[PDB]
């Protein structure tokens, strides 16, 4: 059960103990949170360069979250107040209608093999596509362990840019199926592995061989439904809040200035979960925002509609390149503990949870903005 | 002097001591970094909700960084390796040509007063513009202290959207000059303060009254110059690396897939400095990426050119809404220490340093990508 009565009123230690026997955490786990210094300086000096100490941020746990029926405790790490309070409140509201319904796609990341110096980019493109299976085999032969787990290269997509400032270019895409890893290093290696062969076929000169953070092939989805009766406040009625939420969305869909803050709200829920799991939060931000302006217009990441049943339905679909076997995820004592609290067994499972927390946050942010204002809640929670 | 010989080889304690007497830090400061738990649980339980403990990340210090002649030590907080090593290396290279040259604009943030229900958005627009000074006075009367420091409302910009899915809308912008604060709360209050008056003039129904993180009015700039001779490697020559760096930029400027990673690298340097200062890293990310696609095309945040002198010149201009008097910046013992190491006296001073670290990072990321080929 994710519901935690009077949890916000409970003392930190009381909370850590409650969460402890609830999940059945060993003392060895509770001690990592009980005392400061869970990350030894010998390990901290192994992650970054020029380490002189450690910086710490609050480690909270959101409640009420329910993904596909299964209850789950979401660990968050931020400095901004109201975030954990809103994510949990909206999560409580979604419960009454089935919580959050999520889904995802195969962990498909893609490398880029930039080739310049070609005089016939278009012709050379077909040369690559026709010898695609060769290029694929070579890529896989490098990372066979990945193929053992069911991952590996799946397909190649060659694109051209004859309008490049520095002459025509040929950018081939290696759609590699990573597994429970973000795929950064896995993909980057395959890119540098096939680099020689592609260069031999097109007769060009390979430049960059890096992955693309705009993982539009590794999407994660999340849905919610909010009955008007649930949003009925003392002043405003249920119906009144729904229209407001809809106006707030229309605004963000047409004006980039509002879209910026709107999407920022979404990230406020996703980022904290990423830092806690030890994942690269910057990769998530880059793929999120870039996907938000894929139609030549910076728009909203979430969508808020009112089904023909009167209910408020919102969704969230965005690139979610997150892992479980990554570098920092395995070396940080708390990163491993975060995964244990979540109970996630795969990267995509974690991905689905991340987009659910975001969809919830955005809902809470807009509900307040349309209800009264933003100061009442945030500022109250923003004491001192 | 920001140069730190064999700093990377020095032990953590050795580094903390070296940084200690260099800056003349008291034992009270060094102890915050020496021992774990610089952030007491009573304070940690006051920032976020449902706090059960604390999460810690490495706290590093980049070297060689020189902004406008003045040397400075940049504190960074990340989990990804190579970041602090690259930012410091490229910083060492920029030294030979004057380090980094930065500049900024007045800390101008802007609120949004969305007004729906108006049947004549365009006409109602002029009604607001003509009674602008009234709306301005009311806004300032609220935050009297801000005006004492030289901040306060400066101008109002009303925009219309008759093409909105939910009918026509009227979005007025309150260009408020915050000072050393990000302006979030300062601006949000003024927006809700003028909300009634605007509603009276246009006859509409005010909806949202929130700030816009796309702070394109609070820009920060940074420039660098890299002599080809400096980039000359064992295999590749100086000239050879410059062209590669240029190819790498052209790629990001035309293709969004490369731009995403390109800009990600820039943030790899800016974000760590933000977390260390206790600032909202997410606001920075939102304003950064949104500004990257302001021309209907997601492009590069930095620019790499080759002056008619043969040298490689790069720049960086982006929204930098960062503060010094914010909520978390003041309550975190280390956030205050980070500001002390930086020696910054204003928010914009910190803003200029943030864009310099980013411009350096992007340079290092591309240099490597172009250097070690097939
Ligand atoms: N990014 C967003 O969309 C968003 C929105 C709302 C709140 N927030 C949160 O609010 C915080 C940032 O808001 P804030 O920094 O405006 O709030 P704040 O209240 O902490 O700081 C502003 C206050 O500081 C005072 N002040 C003193 N000296 C000042 C100076 N020299 N210059 C400017 N103001 C000065 C002012 O009186 C003002 O009331 C962050 O913690 C952020 O998480 C973010
Ligand atoms: C609440 C908000 O206006 C500010 C986030 O601090 C953003 C959003 O609408 O999602």
mmCIF file of N, CA and C and ligand atoms in Angstrom, chain A residues 80 261 264 378 382, chain B residues 143 145-146 149 179-186 188 211 213 280 283 325-327, ligand 1:
data_model
loop_
_atom_site.group_PDB
_atom_site.id
_atom_site.type_symbol
_atom_site.label_atom_id
_atom_site.label_comp_id
_atom_site.label_asym_id
_atom_site.label_seq_id
_atom_site.Cartn_x
_atom_site.Cartn_y
_atom_site.Cartn_z
ATOM 1 N N UNK A 80 13.466 22.292 -4.323
ATOM 2 C CA UNK A 80 12.246 23.082 -4.491
ATOM 3 C C UNK A 80 11.050 22.445 -3.780
ATOM 4 N N UNK A 261 7.462 27.016 -19.121
ATOM 5 C CA UNK A 261 7.179 26.798 -17.707
ATOM 6 C C UNK A 261 6.358 25.523 -17.503
ATOM 7 N N UNK A 264 8.506 22.677 -17.783
ATOM 8 C CA UNK A 264 9.411 22.749 -16.639
ATOM 9 C C UNK A 264 8.734 22.036 -15.472
ATOM 10 N N UNK A 378 2.522 26.676 -2.975
ATOM 11 C CA UNK A 378 3.981 26.723 -3.007
ATOM 12 C C UNK A 378 4.573 27.543 -1.868
ATOM 13 N N UNK A 382 6.728 26.909 1.122
ATOM 14 C CA UNK A 382 7.990 27.624 0.978
ATOM 15 C C UNK A 382 8.271 28.490 2.202
ATOM 16 N N UNK B 143 5.843 45.445 -4.114
ATOM 17 C CA UNK B 143 7.213 45.154 -3.703
ATOM 18 C C UNK B 143 8.046 46.428 -3.595
ATOM 19 N N UNK B 145 10.405 47.216 -1.357
ATOM 20 C CA UNK B 145 11.810 46.934 -1.070
ATOM 21 C C UNK B 145 12.624 46.670 -2.335
ATOM 22 N N UNK B 146 12.006 46.029 -3.321
ATOM 23 C CA UNK B 146 12.689 45.726 -4.573
ATOM 24 C C UNK B 146 13.137 46.997 -5.283
ATOM 25 N N UNK B 149 16.244 48.533 -3.976
ATOM 26 C CA UNK B 149 17.460 47.904 -4.475
ATOM 27 C C UNK B 149 17.692 48.194 -5.958
ATOM 28 N N UNK B 179 16.531 41.429 -9.077
ATOM 29 C CA UNK B 179 17.911 41.862 -8.887
ATOM 30 C C UNK B 179 18.865 40.681 -8.803
ATOM 31 N N UNK B 180 19.122 40.217 -7.587
ATOM 32 C CA UNK B 180 20.006 39.080 -7.377
ATOM 33 C C UNK B 180 19.207 37.804 -7.119
ATOM 34 N N UNK B 181 17.902 37.874 -7.372
ATOM 35 C CA UNK B 181 17.011 36.731 -7.206
ATOM 36 C C UNK B 181 16.553 36.230 -8.572
ATOM 37 N N UNK B 182 16.202 34.948 -8.645
ATOM 38 C CA UNK B 182 15.713 34.355 -9.889
ATOM 39 C C UNK B 182 14.453 35.098 -10.334
ATOM 40 N N UNK B 183 13.707 35.595 -9.352
ATOM 41 C CA UNK B 183 12.501 36.361 -9.617
ATOM 42 C C UNK B 183 11.194 35.589 -9.612
ATOM 43 N N UNK B 184 11.249 34.265 -9.506
ATOM 44 C CA UNK B 184 10.043 33.430 -9.512
ATOM 45 C C UNK B 184 8.906 33.984 -8.653
ATOM 46 N N UNK B 185 9.122 34.006 -7.344
ATOM 47 C CA UNK B 185 8.124 34.478 -6.390
ATOM 48 C C UNK B 185 7.870 35.985 -6.473
ATOM 49 N N UNK B 186 8.930 36.763 -6.679
ATOM 50 C CA UNK B 186 8.806 38.216 -6.787
ATOM 51 C C UNK B 186 7.847 38.596 -7.914
ATOM 52 N N UNK B 188 5.690 36.398 -9.652
ATOM 53 C CA UNK B 188 4.394 35.733 -9.470
ATOM 54 C C UNK B 188 3.422 36.547 -8.614
ATOM 55 N N UNK B 211 5.072 33.192 -13.936
ATOM 56 C CA UNK B 211 6.235 33.677 -14.664
ATOM 57 C C UNK B 211 6.515 32.748 -15.837
ATOM 58 N N UNK B 213 9.542 30.825 -17.748
ATOM 59 C CA UNK B 213 10.918 30.405 -17.585
ATOM 60 C C UNK B 213 11.750 30.714 -18.826
ATOM 61 N N UNK B 280 17.590 26.231 -8.942
ATOM 62 C CA UNK B 280 16.688 25.321 -9.650
ATOM 63 C C UNK B 280 17.285 25.019 -11.033
ATOM 64 N N UNK B 283 14.756 24.990 -14.194
ATOM 65 C CA UNK B 283 14.330 26.255 -14.785
ATOM 66 C C UNK B 283 15.350 26.635 -15.856
ATOM 67 N N UNK B 325 19.891 35.116 -3.580
ATOM 68 C CA UNK B 325 19.053 35.310 -2.396
ATOM 69 C C UNK B 325 17.849 34.366 -2.373
ATOM 70 N N UNK B 326 17.855 33.382 -3.270
ATOM 71 C CA UNK B 326 16.768 32.419 -3.355
ATOM 72 C C UNK B 326 16.544 31.628 -2.079
ATOM 73 N N UNK B 327 15.514 30.786 -2.091
ATOM 74 C CA UNK B 327 15.177 29.975 -0.934
ATOM 75 C C UNK B 327 16.237 28.964 -0.534
HETATM 76 N N1 LIG C 1 10.811 28.039 -12.247
HETATM 77 C C1 LIG C 1 9.543 28.169 -11.868
HETATM 78 O O1 LIG C 1 8.633 28.039 -12.683
HETATM 79 C C2 LIG C 1 9.203 28.486 -10.396
HETATM 80 C C3 LIG C 1 7.952 29.035 -10.085
HETATM 81 C C4 LIG C 1 7.612 29.343 -8.770
HETATM 82 C C5 LIG C 1 8.520 29.108 -7.746
HETATM 83 N N2 LIG C 1 9.787 28.558 -8.031
HETATM 84 C C6 LIG C 1 10.722 28.356 -6.897
HETATM 85 O O2 LIG C 1 10.900 29.624 -6.226
HETATM 86 C C7 LIG C 1 12.308 29.853 -5.991
HETATM 87 C C8 LIG C 1 12.768 31.042 -6.814
HETATM 88 O O3 LIG C 1 11.912 32.169 -6.515
HETATM 89 P P1 LIG C 1 12.538 33.543 -5.961
HETATM 90 O O4 LIG C 1 14.016 33.375 -5.988
HETATM 91 O O5 LIG C 1 11.957 34.621 -6.797
HETATM 92 O O6 LIG C 1 11.987 33.641 -4.431
HETATM 93 P P2 LIG C 1 12.398 34.290 -2.996
HETATM 94 O O7 LIG C 1 11.186 34.813 -2.313
HETATM 95 O O8 LIG C 1 13.218 33.338 -2.212
HETATM 96 O O9 LIG C 1 13.329 35.531 -3.396
HETATM 97 C C9 LIG C 1 12.738 36.797 -3.709
HETATM 98 C C10 LIG C 1 12.650 37.635 -2.450
HETATM 99 O O10 LIG C 1 13.975 38.022 -2.036
HETATM 100 C C11 LIG C 1 13.983 39.426 -1.735
HETATM 101 N N3 LIG C 1 15.219 40.052 -2.277
HETATM 102 C C12 LIG C 1 16.180 40.476 -1.418
HETATM 103 N N4 LIG C 1 17.212 40.921 -2.124
HETATM 104 C C13 LIG C 1 16.835 40.756 -3.359
HETATM 105 C C14 LIG C 1 17.626 41.100 -4.441
HETATM 106 N N5 LIG C 1 18.838 41.631 -4.257
HETATM 107 N N6 LIG C 1 17.142 40.896 -5.681
HETATM 108 C C15 LIG C 1 15.927 40.368 -5.868
HETATM 109 N N7 LIG C 1 15.155 40.030 -4.830
HETATM 110 C C16 LIG C 1 15.598 40.214 -3.566
HETATM 111 C C17 LIG C 1 12.743 40.052 -2.320
HETATM 112 O O11 LIG C 1 12.094 40.855 -1.318
HETATM 113 C C18 LIG C 1 11.852 38.890 -2.728
HETATM 114 O O12 LIG C 1 10.653 38.885 -1.941
HETATM 115 C C19 LIG C 1 13.049 28.598 -6.391
HETATM 116 O O13 LIG C 1 13.283 27.836 -5.206
HETATM 117 C C20 LIG C 1 12.088 27.846 -7.310
HETATM 118 O O14 LIG C 1 12.164 26.404 -7.100
HETATM 119 C C21 LIG C 1 10.127 28.243 -9.370
#
